[PDB]
Design a protein around this ligand. Structure first.
Ligand SMILES: [Cl-]
Ligand SMILES: [Cl-]
Ligand SMILES: [Cl-]
Ligand SMILES: [Cl-]
Ligand SMILES: [Cl-]
Ligand SMILES: [Cl-]
Lengths: 254, 253
């Protein structure tokens, strides 16, 4: 069963990539996003007709009234990158069992880079194991932040506080920032105003690399996709090392 | 000349082999120095009468003076390189009597090379490219970067321009200008760039149909010489001359 989930997830990512490559650097993004979601959904349900999907394009879909397994998808996380021809958007696929992510993929179909996190296993990039790196103090950290997606003033004040404490503050890049964290190239990623289809896939990838990812209070990030769930916005902080994470929480003062 | 192009490509190939050895393995200092060595060796093997110029060593030439000077940056975007993001680039400019006549923006990981040569349309991996038309600054896609020398006046100007455009995004060193030259964005604005990070851009952008100037709209120029000082400049590049002028009006420089 679990191998089957990984195999189908990879097929779904391959189908999405084939669509996205028809559109990138040729609206095209709306067509690409819709078509890629459809491609993924068809793969998923051909294999697992008792599952549900929740997608960034069309919301909840299930041919039954409920499902134990829900695939939460964003074919193009980073539409602004995609539109401007920058190959740092990604396709996100999460599989949730009873609301808990058990598999997440971050796929860059132009660069041909795929991070896969699966519960029980170490995260891989193109089949090779990856790890976060150790970092003992926030003053030594490499950080990605992005402008608040819902323009929160309070969020910006928190962003200033954390950027002032780190070694190198850099501007983020959607899911790709977290991929680089999971591979050990940066220490901290902070973002405000993300919907669940843009973070759930991240969780198994980061945790299975040895990192940590929570909301800005340090609480578990959780969104139980269901027929009635509402895709609200969340604030996220991810770290390669637990010590740095806690120091970041202290700076966010949330 | 076609000979100058051939050699510039050989130099970019030599830098790319070095860079790909070190990327995602200080690593950056070694990669930067070794890639500059590789480039210089190809350049001077072919043109012993030419000069080279880089940040670390400044002007070098076997002779006291040179009509042709190659101005290099092996890794424009060291922070991207160190964090494993493949959006840094190698920049090569050849200047004849102080004027850029060839520029390369090379992304050795992504295997993307933009070449500008005076007289020719700019190419990406051998295919001609073009900037796009854009009707008004309110429709523009913009890259800006934080001021490199932390100028508060520059930040005020950035705020003005970002507030006028359609989509304000954060830049990415030379790669932003590459995307401009290929017609995927309309405007790039940066403050506090040294000449080794902008000279190569000029033939690339102009040969794609775009415009690049300082914030007053004046020609970007820097004659590399034995006594030149690598000062810092403010740069604005656009795909379309009309957007360029509106940008200058918002910068109020
Ligand atoms: Cl099933
Ligand atoms: Cl926000
Ligand atoms: Cl939060
Ligand atoms: Cl010679
Ligand atoms: Cl500045
Ligand atoms: Cl200026």
């Amino acid at each position: 069963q679990l191998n089957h989930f990984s195999d189908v997830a990879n097929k779904a990512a391959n189908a999405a990539g084939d669509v996205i490559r028809k559109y990138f650097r040729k609206s095209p993004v709306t067509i690409a996003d819709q078509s890629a979601e459809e491609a993924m959904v068809s793969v998923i349900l051909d294999n697992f007709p008792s599952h549900a999907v929740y997608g960034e394009e069309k919301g909840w879909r299930c041919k039954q009234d409920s499902a134990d397994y829900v695939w939460v998808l964003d074919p193009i996380d980073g539409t602004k990158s995609f539109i401007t021809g920058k190959p740092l958007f990604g396709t996100l696929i999460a599989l949730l069992q009873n609301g808990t992510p058990i598999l997440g993929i971050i796929d860059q179909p132009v660069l041909k880079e795929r991070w896969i996190g699966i519960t029980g296993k170490r995260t891989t990039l193109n089949g090779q194991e990856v790890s976060t790196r150790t970092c003992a103090d926030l003053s030594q950290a490499y950080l990605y932040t992005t402008s608040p997606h819902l323009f929160s003033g309070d969020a910006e004040e928190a962003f200033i506080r954390v950027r002032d404490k780190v070694k190198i503050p850099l501007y983020g890049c959607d899911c790709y920032a977290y991929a680089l964290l999971s591979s050990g190239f940066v220490d901290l990623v902070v973002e405000s105003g993300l919907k669940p289809y843009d973070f759930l896939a991240l969780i198994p990838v980061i945790e299975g690399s040895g990192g940590v990812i929570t909301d800005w209070k340090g609480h578990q990030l959780r969104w139980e996709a269901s027929p009635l769930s509402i895709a609200t916005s969340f604030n996220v902080v991810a770290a390669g090392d637990k010590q740095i994470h806690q120091q970041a929480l202290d700076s966010l003062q949330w």
